[PDB]
Motif scaffolding. Structure first.
Motif, PDB file in Angstrom:
ATOM      1  N   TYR C  92      47.699  27.657 -30.140  1.00 41.82           N
ATOM      2  CA  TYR C  92      46.575  27.404 -31.033  1.00 41.82           C
ATOM      3  C   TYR C  92      45.781  26.160 -30.656  1.00 41.82           C
ATOM      4  CZ  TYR C  92      48.168  31.100 -34.145  1.00 41.82           C
ATOM      5  OH  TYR C  92      48.520  32.319 -34.677  1.00 41.82           O
TER       6      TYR C  92
ATOM      7  N   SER D  84      62.613  39.200 -39.736  1.00 41.33           N
ATOM      8  CA  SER D  84      61.717  39.092 -40.880  1.00 41.33           C
ATOM      9  C   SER D  84      61.580  37.648 -41.345  1.00 41.33           C
ATOM     10  CB  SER D  84      62.223  39.978 -42.019  1.00 41.33           C
ATOM     11  OG  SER D  84      61.683  39.570 -43.264  1.00 41.33           O
ATOM     12  N   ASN D  85      62.691  36.908 -41.375  1.00 40.97           N
ATOM     13  CA  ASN D  85      62.649  35.519 -41.823  1.00 40.97           C
ATOM     14  C   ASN D  85      61.822  34.656 -40.877  1.00 40.97           C
ATOM     15  OD1 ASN D  85      64.214  35.482 -44.285  1.00 40.97           O
ATOM     16  ND2 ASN D  85      66.025  35.901 -43.030  1.00 40.97           N
ATOM     17  N   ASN D  88      57.994  35.481 -41.236  1.00 46.28           N
ATOM     18  CA  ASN D  88      57.425  35.082 -42.519  1.00 46.28           C
ATOM     19  C   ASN D  88      57.342  33.566 -42.661  1.00 46.28           C
ATOM     20  OD1 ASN D  88      57.766  34.661 -45.779  1.00 46.28           O
ATOM     21  ND2 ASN D  88      56.646  36.537 -45.269  1.00 46.28           N
ATOM     22  N   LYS D  91      53.919  32.561 -41.364  1.00 50.23           N
ATOM     23  CA  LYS D  91      52.960  33.633 -41.625  1.00 50.23           C
ATOM     24  C   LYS D  91      51.512  33.159 -41.560  1.00 50.23           C
ATOM     25  CE  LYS D  91      54.106  32.748 -46.262  1.00 50.23           C
ATOM     26  NZ  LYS D  91      55.358  33.114 -46.982  1.00 50.23           N
ATOM     27  N   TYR D  92      51.257  31.880 -41.844  1.00 54.56           N
ATOM     28  CA  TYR D  92      49.900  31.354 -41.764  1.00 54.56           C
ATOM     29  C   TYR D  92      49.536  30.841 -40.377  1.00 54.56           C
ATOM     30  CZ  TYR D  92      49.411  31.756 -46.813  1.00 54.56           C
ATOM     31  OH  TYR D  92      49.316  32.243 -48.096  1.00 54.56           O
ATOM     32  N   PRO D  94      50.771  32.828 -37.416  1.00 54.31           N
ATOM     33  CA  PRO D  94      51.769  33.867 -37.149  1.00 54.31           C
ATOM     34  C   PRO D  94      51.790  34.340 -35.705  1.00 54.31           C
ATOM     35  CG  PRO D  94      49.830  34.884 -38.043  1.00 54.31           C
ATOM     36  CD  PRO D  94      49.531  33.398 -37.975  1.00 54.31           C
ATOM     37  N   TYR D  95      52.873  35.045 -35.383  1.00 51.94           N
ATOM     38  CA  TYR D  95      52.939  35.839 -34.165  1.00 51.94           C
ATOM     39  C   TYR D  95      52.121  37.110 -34.364  1.00 51.94           C
ATOM     40  CZ  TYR D  95      56.944  32.833 -33.043  1.00 51.94           C
ATOM     41  OH  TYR D  95      57.764  31.759 -32.792  1.00 51.94           O
ATOM     42  N   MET D  96      51.194  37.379 -33.444  1.00 52.86           N
ATOM     43  CA  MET D  96      50.332  38.557 -33.548  1.00 52.86           C
ATOM     44  C   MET D  96      51.016  39.721 -32.839  1.00 52.86           C
ATOM     45  SD  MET D  96      47.584  36.912 -34.958  1.00 52.86           S
ATOM     46  CE  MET D  96      46.232  38.047 -34.651  1.00 52.86           C
ATOM     47  N   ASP D 114      56.296  44.010 -39.257  1.00 54.51           N
ATOM     48  CA  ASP D 114      54.926  43.576 -39.029  1.00 54.51           C
ATOM     49  C   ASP D 114      54.870  42.073 -38.771  1.00 54.51           C
ATOM     50  OD1 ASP D 114      54.427  42.069 -41.626  1.00 54.51           O
ATOM     51  OD2 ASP D 114      54.820  44.055 -42.456  1.00 54.51           O
ATOM     52  N   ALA D 116      53.718  39.668 -40.648  1.00 51.69           N
ATOM     53  CA  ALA D 116      54.063  38.838 -41.797  1.00 51.69           C
ATOM     54  C   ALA D 116      55.543  38.906 -42.158  1.00 51.69           C
ATOM     55  CB  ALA D 116      53.216  39.240 -43.008  1.00 51.69           C
ATOM     56  N   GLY D 117      56.341  39.665 -41.412  1.00 56.87           N
ATOM     57  CA  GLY D 117      57.760  39.762 -41.679  1.00 56.87           C
ATOM     58  C   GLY D 117      58.185  40.930 -42.539  1.00 56.87           C
ATOM     59  N   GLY D 118      57.275  41.841 -42.871  1.00 59.21           N
ATOM     60  CA  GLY D 118      57.642  43.020 -43.630  1.00 59.21           C
ATOM     61  C   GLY D 118      58.474  43.992 -42.819  1.00 59.21           C
ATOM     62  N   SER D 119      59.705  44.247 -43.258  1.00 60.10           N
ATOM     63  CA  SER D 119      60.634  45.118 -42.551  1.00 60.10           C
ATOM     64  C   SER D 119      60.986  46.305 -43.434  1.00 60.10           C
ATOM     65  CB  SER D 119      61.902  44.356 -42.150  1.00 60.10           C
ATOM     66  OG  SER D 119      62.866  45.226 -41.588  1.00 60.10           O
TER      67      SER D 119
ATOM     68  N   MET F  22      50.861  49.970 -43.876  1.00 60.83           N
ATOM     69  CA  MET F  22      50.990  48.866 -42.933  1.00 60.83           C
ATOM     70  C   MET F  22      50.114  49.157 -41.726  1.00 60.83           C
ATOM     71  SD  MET F  22      54.568  47.070 -41.772  1.00 60.83           S
ATOM     72  CE  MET F  22      55.229  47.199 -43.429  1.00 60.83           C
ATOM     73  N   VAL F  49      54.304  42.874 -48.161  1.00 61.17           N
ATOM     74  CA  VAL F  49      55.717  43.223 -48.025  1.00 61.17           C
ATOM     75  C   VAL F  49      56.527  42.016 -47.566  1.00 61.17           C
ATOM     76  CG1 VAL F  49      57.351  44.780 -46.911  1.00 61.17           C
ATOM     77  CG2 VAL F  49      55.080  45.607 -47.556  1.00 61.17           C
ATOM     78  N   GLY F  50      55.989  41.251 -46.615  1.00 56.51           N
ATOM     79  CA  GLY F  50      56.740  40.135 -46.062  1.00 56.51           C
ATOM     80  C   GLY F  50      57.066  39.068 -47.087  1.00 56.51           C
ATOM     81  N   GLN F  53      59.670  40.479 -49.808  1.00 57.07           N
ATOM     82  CA  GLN F  53      61.058  40.603 -49.374  1.00 57.07           C
ATOM     83  C   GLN F  53      61.740  39.243 -49.285  1.00 57.07           C
ATOM     84  OE1 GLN F  53      60.213  42.846 -45.775  1.00 57.07           O
ATOM     85  NE2 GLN F  53      61.110  44.702 -46.658  1.00 57.07           N
TER      86      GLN F  53
END
Lengths: 202, 202, 202, 202, 202, 202, 202, 202, 202, 202
Positions: C92, D84-85, D88, D91-92, D94-96, D114, D116-119, F22, F49-50, F53
């Motif tokens: 970044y 996921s942890n 998340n 998340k601001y 983030p990994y794209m 995803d 944002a860590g949604g699993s 998603m 979701v992230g 969870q």
């Protein structure tokens, strides 16, 4: 893009390069930027190709029509004044061009015209991205007492310096000489090629 | 999109690919980008499909009407000049296209015209996203002394290189050959398929 | 800027040009863009000069320190992995560079690394504004069976094509050959000058 | 980019393509997007190359360290929970990336995670620009009762459809099969090449 | 929204779903998106409902008027050309629609037209948010040798896959079959309901 | 997404659907949105979701730790108060979630908590894009005097109405019933499937 | 604002509330939103008051003029088609309205028209901020077999639910019943007041 | 602002002008832009005055401290490398300067350093707004075989040309000559004034 | 740009410099900014060259036409009033100029007119970037009792001060003197050159 | 605001006006802008009042502390260097001031320092909105050979001219004279009032 026009005792010398950039990158090496628009009048174009080519066709028609009705060539100052009016009339939707007009009605003249229609006479002028390098050469070497042959060498040297330092300029150099005794004469490519070898600009 | 046009001693060779992207993604594999617009004139289109197709229909009508009134084909330079005027007239609400015009009036010509109406002649030219890869092939392999058969092989190789590196290009290659003795001849797909096998481009 | 790196049976060939643009315009004609960073490892740099030069000094220190502690040269894949971590850590606030790493640990490798740290191995790769023209030459002429002499000719031809079409590239061509038997060998300028005359690229 | 992962009675099948776009255009044809991260765990990566490669190295270290301390393999759900942890937490910034994790602890699992860590667990899932074309094939042809051989054919057909319609996808197809009896087995390229001929996908 | 149109040996098959979203959320379940505009011509509409309905009324009037004056049906290519001109004329204040036109003048044709007026012929095409899922089904199952009954089953399966994955699509499936021997025939709802039970799509 | 929670004389009923979107489009049909976080406490999640969870795992750890130290279950109001503090502490870098917490300490409670930490008790509440349709059903049919069986039917009907009108909601309905006499009981899928047939919601 | 229109076997029922917000806050409690525009046609208005009132006056003039010249009432579909054309003609300077048109020419119809002119027929429809709550009531209670009296009760219950949950809606409920045998009949306020007491909506 | 530095056989020549613009307009005519920073090292500054003066004081301290500890002068390349590191470390909060460093350790060197820390060696270089005019003079007149006296005349002529064409440059010309035999020698103003009269630059 | 106009007992003195900046940098040293527009009227121009030159031609035509019809010269106040109307009529698409009008009808007048058409009479006024320096000289040295010779010296001194401090101004000074007895007289360059030597301004 | 500082043979003269604008409009007529900061050092302040007053207190403390430790007054150049460092250290959160520092260590000096810390010595300098008018007076009247009495008259005349033309300046003029023989002497108001009457500036 690099165009140059100089005045001598009874002559006008104009010269440009040929590199054209379109959609970025060098897509044409042998573009045309020096036009004869009257018996003793030439014009060089810098900027957007589309706007410049339209203006060249407009001037050729207007000057020829003016010649037929008035039975005399349009004076060089009148040529610049006509161009100034056209560009200023659409200044808020303008042609993105910079123009040089040179020729001999009774004395040699060179005129520089901007996009907004500002026209001003000068002994010599240069336009395009490579113009500041040309001005450096002309500031230190130009003399009003040079002969036609010496003046041809000077513009070749000035453009060659611009080609070394401006990536937007390049290609073969086109030179035109305007006199009352010979009219508008475009120098052959073989002569200019010989001159660069004799001058030392490779 | 990849279009290419080259000039030879008495011939003009034009070739494009067929991939069309619409609403993103490859939605058409066999689009048409090479058009015959006169007896000895062809045009290739790159950019927005809608604007390009409208221009093709306009040129077909204008050139046919010009032929009927003047009893002669429009010269290739006149074809590019007419296109230049139309595009420059709406430059602030422009056609988002890049065009190549090639043909033979008495000599072979290829013209490149941008969206703003800038027209410039060249021995060869390429347009589209795959054009820079084509220029690399042409810079190292093109020769003005090639035969028609050799020239057909070169454009096939150049487009094949673009298809390997440009995701926006793809599909079957269309080739047209223009000569005075045969007119506008579109090469059959079976011949080009044979050529790629013989050339080694799979 | 144009850099190229190719792999052969037991050799790695890397070559760049020398033109540097700073504050616009060509202000340096003989810049350095090809560096030896280890006994059998070289790197080429494209992008911002300041960021690239800092990275070169970093890699020289890290690879030399790694050699002293481990008593062995860093593997080429490890070199690319280390560079990938450094660039991704500041993604970044990134280095605006594109890098090529080539060398021989037990086999020849060439790695391409972007600004975000993405590293991927390839048989050949090119970076800079002139790279797409190089890819066209390599797509149609590269062969894994070429000799070292043939491979040197290919990269000279590919860069010469880029210099004709990319205004940001220019200057004298620098070539380095890496083998286990000779180590990192930078080809003399006189040899490359002889090659261009023999190749026909003026 | 196109990645796919499916579950069978006692097997997990994962497959990706190899096309990599960097600085636009196809600069690598044989990228790596399918990784083995544990004895019975694989991961596929879509999105930015730099972020994805860093995450792969992180998971390899964490899973190996977890195995040494706990004397057992990390459960597949625990693998997705750990990923996921990490995603998340930043998340601001983030990994794209979009990730697929599959394997067998006591039953086959496939997890989709995803940026944002949604699993979320699924019987089959697909990621990348070519994923919607894959979902069309899987919606109409997938069956939980297929054999391993039939499942390998399905993912090859699904990716082949994506390569026809997604310009960002291409290259050779990589396939890995995970079972308790054989562990993580990457199918040889020669077998997949044979399968495509037998399947009819050219 | 999901529309599909395919070509067979002597038939054209078009099918759409019925879900309409207005002011967000599903406010209509039984919208109309498939229209007969001539004796052997149909059109499907995707995008803004208001613009699409206006265009349908325009085409019905133009095609009927054309039939009365010319005593023959408008050719399918002429139908697409007329639509292309209308959309391109207002491209800067455009209709936000995507259109499919299919029918038989002497052979079956399907045309895809975008908002800017780009028209291109294809053997099959799909529009709307659910179109990429349809393309996956068609890429792996379509054959030019299918019968009319098999072709009806294929479009039902393709749309059913889109309804499973696209939330913007849904509702009952409308199917129309166009042949010279029967004209424009809209399949009864009871037959399609029977087909889905026999096909297994619930 | 549609979640609902209602209170009865000695019971709490919570129910959600399973559709997960998603990267747009329906990529998961059987997501999990209803969690048991204590012996007599459940939570439903709507939004990202992230973030959701992560919060579920946090509450499970905090409530279990609270139970071990205090030897008593956390009161439902204390559960909402703890969640309110955590969300408000990061309100300017917030969790993009909407939460429902329900359970019985000595009386049934349902709490609604927004992203900024605003917590308010209600007899019934609904969250997600499909919530306004649920509120319409509850406004006209809910009664505090219903039995547990009648309350289960009401939430099934309310969610079924939301699935008909909200494209973001769908999938199988999950229902949990909380009482002191039975604890946290998740209703089997077979029972809910039977209920929908008996209720008439297909 | 909450408007609703439903269709029965030989009847059309339309009902709205009366709350008007102007310069924010409730400045009028007894606004008019249900208009009779023909012998058997009614219209409800939602959105900007100024645009809606202008359209109502336009439709009254057009329908009356149409009746005098054609000696027959305008068909309901023709009423919606005329409104669709007017709204779409000024779509870029549009009326900020949502409209419902209902009536009986030979069968009962209800049409929903958006600001851009999109018109679609439905058995029932609702507009305004309170519409989603109405759809929940209609999704779970509407039946095509209800009597006129039962249908009047349903719309009263649906609007009453919207008034409880939508702050923009409120005031006394206006109901109109359209049949061929009685024409356009607006139900007296005393009858609706009696109905709400009998229904239990206070 | 105009600064120039050139290399000769055993000498380094540096020269700048004195015009300083602050709060717009010419507020100082005799500013200082040429500094001696070591026994055989000089530096010229262009850009923001505040940043440039801070850097000059930093280099004087660092070079003097380096001399005391190492008992030898810092090499010219080391001087440029040290400056490169400092500027690149704060590249995102950078010094808005352009710098030239020249001197003799064992051979004459001139280094050009940009704001981002990019350092490159050249035989001659120029910075400031008047630099392009200087490059034109140097391109056509510089020779590596000139004597010290001839080199002094060249830089005076080059700056004089810049003063004629660049409004930001002006004032008296400062010249410094660096040799091993004489050290750092600043030419007296009276000598330069004599030179301009002899050269003809007024 | 620096223009000045002063009033005396029976005379008007106007003077400007000649520097013109176009495309940045000093491209013309001998521009014309002082024009005679009537027998006893002059005008100076500052701002955009194109707009100013158009206005000068307009005023020359209008004043000459006014003279022929009215047989008398236009009064100076009428000249400023006419200019005020023209500029104010296009104030939202204005001429980017600042103008000074001076002359004698029966008394000397100097008028200052801005771009919006605001006209105000003054004893002396100055325009351009160098005007504030001129006002300082005039504030401390101007006297209404000076002779014509003293007034000529004052304007020369005032402009000379502006040339020392304003980089946009420069070049040779043009001076015009207007009296009833001599008319409009432009002072010869040799006289002004003599004056500067006598005044001490070099 | 108008401040001026000049140097003489053995004296420094500084003078400012008193008008202060705060919250727009003239709210203070007798502000203080000239400060004594050492035995033979004064400073004038222009710009924001708050930042300027803080800097004055800082310099008084630093110079007094420097005097006590070094037993000598800080040299004037050291005073400007110290101020330059402080302003440049916070250049991105800067003091919005323009400063003049004058005094005698062994010779008279006047230093001008901008907000970014740029410091440059001059024989005379002026700051504030009224400074350009002062420069005009000084350009035409200043002489290094004036006496102290003549120098006092010059600064009074220069500021009086600025008060006539700059609305931001006004009020009574404060004058300070610094010599080694008398130290820092602030001229009494009665003397300056007498001078203005004798000078003729009312």
């Amino acid at each position: 893009t690099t165009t140059v026009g100089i005045t001598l005792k009874d002559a006008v010398i104009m010269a440009t390069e040929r590199r054209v950039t379109m959609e970025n990158f060098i897509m044409h090496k042998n573009g045309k930027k020096l036009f004869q628009i009257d018996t003793y009048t030439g014009m060089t174009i810098a900027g957007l190709v589309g706007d410049a080519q339209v203006l060249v066709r407009y001037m050729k028609a207007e000057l020829e029509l003016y010649r037929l009705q008035r039975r005399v060539n349009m004076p060089i100052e009148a040529v610049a004044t006509l161009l100034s009016n056209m560009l200023n009339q659409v200044k808020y939707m303008p042609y993105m061009v910079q123009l040089l007009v040179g020729g001999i009605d009774t004395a040699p003249h060179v005129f520089s015209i901007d996009a907004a229609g500002g026209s001003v006479e000068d002994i010599y002028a240069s336009t395009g991205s490579g113009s500041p390098f040309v001005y450096g050469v002309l500031e230190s070497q130009y003399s009003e007492k040079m002969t036609v042959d010496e003046g041809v060498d000077l513009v070749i040297r000035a453009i060659s310096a611009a080609k070394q330092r401006d990536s937007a300029s390049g290609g073969m150099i086109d030179v035109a000489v305007i006199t009352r005794k010979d009219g508008y004469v475009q120098l052959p490519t073989d002569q200019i090629e010989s001159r660069i070898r004799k001058l030392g600009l490779i």
